[model samples]
Target: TSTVRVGFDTPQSLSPFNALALPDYQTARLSYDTLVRRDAGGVVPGLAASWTGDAAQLTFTIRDGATCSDGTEITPTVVADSLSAFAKNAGPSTVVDTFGGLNPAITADDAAGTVMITPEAPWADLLAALSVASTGIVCPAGLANLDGLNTGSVEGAESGPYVLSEVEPGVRYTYELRDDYDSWPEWETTLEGEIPKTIEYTVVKDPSASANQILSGQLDLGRIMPDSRSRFSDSQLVSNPFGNFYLVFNEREGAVFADEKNREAVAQVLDRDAFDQTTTDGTGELTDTFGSKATQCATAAPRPALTALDESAAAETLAGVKIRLLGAQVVGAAGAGNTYLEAALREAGADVTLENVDIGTWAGRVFGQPESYDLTVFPDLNFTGTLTSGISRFTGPDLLQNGGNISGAVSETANALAQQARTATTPEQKCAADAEAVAALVAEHHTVPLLVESFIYAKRDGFSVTMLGGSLDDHLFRITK
Candidate 1:
């Protein structure tokens, strides 16, 4: 078969510029090329054939003969201009800025066929950060019409293995294999399979429906819930680290959680196992850290030792305590985790009012409007693949929401440990620093951890799926039979 039908979520944006959600980025990968690529081995060459220098200052040699879909040649100037445009046009909601806080100075030497990047600080994960879909290179045509590019109106503005041929917003998207794409020889070697001539990404939001389509041979790849796995016993199942679910308290002065004893009481009454089961259908593992095991340097750190649940002690402290709990339905089914927490808190004698809503609303009230809620179950489902990326959000004034430490519980010790990791010169040093930071956050109870969750995907035969930097590599999809 020359075509591969895929089950995909409704993309928030069609263009790489201002792309936030994983789905939008995932779709961008189909049409845009990153500076580098990652596989099981590690980072490899992509648009740039080779690079030099450290994270603070690096220079990339653009690949020769690279051409955009419109038959225009790619040059160092184009690469530099694309990145500069992205930095200028990317919104605050973009993932690259939201988590990594990426802001770098870029320049290009047209005659030298090179582009150089220099960030203010030494970012150890610079290459990995650039490899994500949000940093996808845009051609001159796409840059000329930013509005058309964002709305998917501009054609031949991309240079990748595939080109966008059709778009039926919220229904289906068609990508035809590019005839002059020069990376297939390398991809053929790395992917170890034939690239499908066409790709059709159809929106199928329902998990069961996606699973059934995969089983019926109508779809080549799709994700399904834990309970639906049994039906695909003979099929290939690929699992990847989703993210960790943890509790973020609104410890503003005069708030109930402002008191350490109150926060501890809430933590003690809660059950990690129960919460994991509720959120992931028992598919996730109970953890005391903010990041998953797949996260770099996550396991190298010792788990923080916190006080265990003491029902008798919690009962007295939580009695008649009025709490407004905000839950976001971004991770799992709507209200599943929130309902479980409400029941447990109510049983502990607390008067809990649970409000489960979309991620935007939850963040608005919890982080934007700090006075609206007392606590929240934060689903740290970001896919940056590094512990520091997630850590930066909760540390001090750079909190994920409004950049203010509304929790008022940022520990100096935790902040120092995380900073060490940020400035570490070597991988080993970064790992060691990350370990210490994880321990500090847990011991301090600045945020109570629940579990690390995994996403389960069902695929057809010979369709290899490996997560590079905690994201699906759609380019590897194949039907070898």
Candidate 2:
């Protein structure tokens, strides 16, 4: 009779290997297990009992009774087949190739119940990279049915402690726990006793509505927005600095933001303090960090100098600049915060017009039609984790496809450094090269850095949940009542 329901702002995918966002991690961990689970503490055994090897080579042995939701054994041969599929898939392949140094050889030994992963070069973060939710292992031959995965069908069947029961595109998903499951030894942590009977995940884009549901007992758990914190005085709150929110400019020449100095001036006028207090409700902090903060080459961002509302300190001014400010109805703000930026820029004598649209339309023009818009303020990244994953966004095919690197900010040296960092053997070397890549983008004003929202996810009293702060590693939820 145990059923747990939670709410998320963004939609999730049923296929484990196909999850692309941060919230997707929660859904993936619920259905498909990973090789290792990572938090701030470090790596721990997951579906695989354990792994032992140096940077050059590592071997993982599957635990006994690691069977599919169909009640079939996840043999070593199946593991190899799934890896082969992922290597060929674009989304999943980026994680392996960019994060794992694009190695071509990965093997599985069925008789010995082990899978060996060896890259061509020493990749120091291999273990850390494996900890991602996108790395969650799926059933054998699962890749063959990925065609209908995002079409409201639960394809690429999974085999963790739970299996997808049903799905509704951009709406909701459900998971049922397998009674035969006894995976506590692998996911050793604060989880108590047996798994619940079922887990229901529903997406309610409105944060206030989500909070109201939690209060009315319609939803068991939900992200408690800053305004709703006082209402849940007794409910346990789980908080973390999840991701950053920023504005992306169209850097093409003749574009409103073509001038580097113009972009920098606009960034300077942004009042991050006004954002944290108003938009975040004093729950987040300013973060000017460029690229993946997880990488070793992270640059020091001294919060781009704040400019006066009237415009004073800068190489150039947007006094006569006519800008078409594009934006979406953002989640954590006071009903679409783009107007605030518009008001600020307008006060600075720039002719700024707010052209806000729904998320779907906003996404279409942000990257789809290069000539459709001039400026857009949205989440710079889809989600955060895995340094190599963010590289493509900054300098690789993703950058080219979206017409994003219009400023010529991404240089050959920066691209070369990213590759070296991914293939580097030690932490010192990986970050050493990472620094140059981050600096190149920052110095050229490629993308403006904003604040990282400190989100708080809470559960009703009597239910138990273990949260992995700053990351979505919390997979286990229990009912005490």
Candidate 3:
């Protein structure tokens, strides 16, 4: 039938640079191409025919015959302009945080068919950062109407294998294959087989129901919960490490958690292993780090000695302590993980109020109304595969600086180490500082690392999918039959 069906969450924005959620990037990948593409293997060419770079600067040779969905030629000047505009308007995106919010100096040489980028400071992961959807190049039409692009209203602005043709607004999005698309990635088999002509993404919030759709043949591919794994034992499956889930305590003055002892007490009563068991049905990977396994230096970060779970110690310190716990609704285990937390804190003799809300409301309460909630389980989606990107959440001054550190948690040592990691000249030096930075944060009880959640993508008998990290790379799906 030359079509594929999959489940998706509600996308916050169609504009790659302004998107606040992961689904937006997943949807954007269908209709837009980045400077480079990354998979399980490594970084590969995308819009750029070839590239060269270092920590200080990078040069990309524009593909000669690349064309946007609107048929506009993708030239060196266009690439430079798009990147410049992205750097200027990007809001709380992975690309921005990875670069430490510094805008690069971009230049185009049309005759040489090259675009050059010189960051204000050294950025070792610049190439990998640019490979994300946040750096997706927009054609002239989309660039002229940036607002329209944000709401998915702009047309002829895409430079990828597919074009966004329809949107159902929280229900579904449809992408149609571009007939003239010939600039396939080096890993794709363009001439060997048929590519899906239409890709349909529907809003399916329930993991069990998504699994049902896949089993019933209504969905070619869908992410299933761990409990549903046995049902798909005969089906093709790919497990993607979604990201790190950790606890963020509100450190505002006068709050219950303002005292380091109270924070430490709460940490003492918590169990990372228990959370992983509840959330992933005991199928998720347990990690001491706070970044996704897909992230490049994920394992390089030094593990901090987590406070052992001791209910007796917690009861002594948390007795009669009033706590307001906010649980991010977009969490794993169907929100059971947070429910278990409330029970544990209650058992520890703390007066706890647990409120489970959607991601938008959760963010508002966490950052805007700090006095309302003392702690939350934050799912850090560090898709850029860099330590600096995830660590920035605890080091920023406010929501403006990459939209993190809202808990008012402060650690001078952690911040200093993060800076050192960012500016270090060698990988070994950067990793050393990154390890220390995480240790400092954990030592201060600013945040506690939880389990690395997994997204299990199961496909029908006749279909196959290639995942990037732990998320679906929609354009890479193939009809195995």
Candidate 4:
């Protein structure tokens, strides 16, 4: 078996149920397989051969010869029961809603080899959530043994192409191939690359070093920022700019950000041009709209500009306005950019203090404890490239230490449209609706997204593969050049 050494900046946990970082989910998926698989094109069949859903019920017909790693036949009942358990335990809220509830309204028919789900209500993101890497279908035995790791191994107790062989805690993790395993071939060109294989996943800790490593054979593949693209000779995996840094203004009573004119003024003074230069090392593109351009799809019309910079207006409007910004050190470039924003706001006659907190505290206090900070800064979005889950961050529950809405903001009309956009199945419909909903959202000015960044994920010159939007689809294959 050949080993392809891979490098990533973030360290990820093997458990799928935990709150993972942006890159952590992709890393954990190396030794896992999902119910359905997604690629650049869209969600396709994986464990299940075919699937269909109506308002109240969704149905799945199991693959003819599908079996777990231990040779147990993956019957419809087993698949349905497994999914139901995941929903109750570790599934995303979207999938939980699709499965009906915590109880999961699902049924499996042994004779017909079919699994049927009767949702408590209708939800559209069922396929997306199920297809995502985090939802890997581990057998009940493997799942039960998730309590301990490193002391022993349980990676072989799943249905994926490779099994977790060893782990070195914060250092690295290794996966070895399963002899008779085969992942869904629909998304990939051919079953040619998965090998007599071994993969070692290690961290780089520096984005700037990725291009150098990939070229020097230190790393078989790596994801680096836009400015680092020039360092590589002939390999790249371009993804939709679905991820970005956001400027979340706290809209609570007696808060300085509660004033709409002040919001407008702050947006104006923030120099995206300078922000791009400092943040992206002069290579980032200024995002023109509130949500990502690909947040919908290419079939639909482009979302019109909502948060376009109004530098001249900031000169006139931001008088005596003050902002207390709480930023998380998630992305490498965000610190310099946040400092730039703070300086620019002060020049525009606004009192701005940039409080850079650790990731945990930033996540806990910014939106979790709203009273802690007025302006919240969080970088990195989901790899799904869909706005369905993001809609809840902007418009869900009461934001005063609320569960769902991370940004203490809400708009009834926008939230309704967001729900429509979330449940939208078609790309054309999703794109148009998401843009419209974003337009409605920016009109209210609760959350602001800016700066078009060309942060890319890439491989060495001889390697190439289609990335699933902002996600990692097939690492076992991606390793080989």
Q: Which candidate comes out best when scored by TM-score?
A: 1
For candidate 4, write residues 179-264 as lDDT tens digits.
76765536643433435377677677677777678768887776777666676554355433534666777776688877778776
Clashing pairs in 4: 285-452, 286-452, 287-451, 287-452
Candidate 3 runs further than 4 Å off: 92-95, 150-155, 166-172, 187-194, 396-403, 469-475
Q: Write the per-residue lDDT of candidate 1 for residues 1-481, one digit (tens) a residue.
A: 7787878788888778767666787778878888887554246688988899874678999988988898888899989988888777886545343223557788999999999887667666766666667777898988998887765736768967787788898888888888888753233134446677888888897898999999999888887887788888645787777768788787776889878788888888788777777788888877766666656666774667866878789899999999998888755677688888888889989999998899878877865677788888777755445666556545757344456455656678877876677667777788787777767766666677787777787888866555654444333567576
Candidate 4 weakest lDDT stretch, 10 residues: 290-299
lDDT of 2 by residue, 1-481 (tens): 4888888756445555566655666776776666777544356777778788755777888877777666678777666666656566636344544235454567999989998888767655677666666666667545657764433334335656776677775677787877777764344345664467888887887888888888888888878777788877654775666555655676665777778777777767777777556667777767655422432234433233333332564324878788888777663453346777787778777877777677667777765665566666565432324334434445643334533342324456667877677666665676566555555555566655566666677778766665442345454577876
lDDT of 1: 0.74
| Top lDDT model | 3
RMSD of each: 2.8, 4.3, 3.0, 3.4
Query: Candidates' TM-scores?
Result: 0.91, 0.80, 0.89, 0.86
TM-score (C-alpha) between model 4 and the true structure = 0.86
Candidate with more favorable, higher lDDT: 2 or 3: 3
Model 2 accuracy (lDDT, Cα): 0.63
Sort by lDDT, best first: 3, 1, 2, 4
Where does the lowest 10-residue lDDT sum fall in candidate 2? 294-303
lDDT of 4: 0.62
CA lDDT, every prediction? Answer: 0.74, 0.63, 0.77, 0.62
| Per-residue lDDT value at 9 in model 1 | 83
Q: For each of the candidates, give the backbone clash count.
A: 0, 3, 1, 4
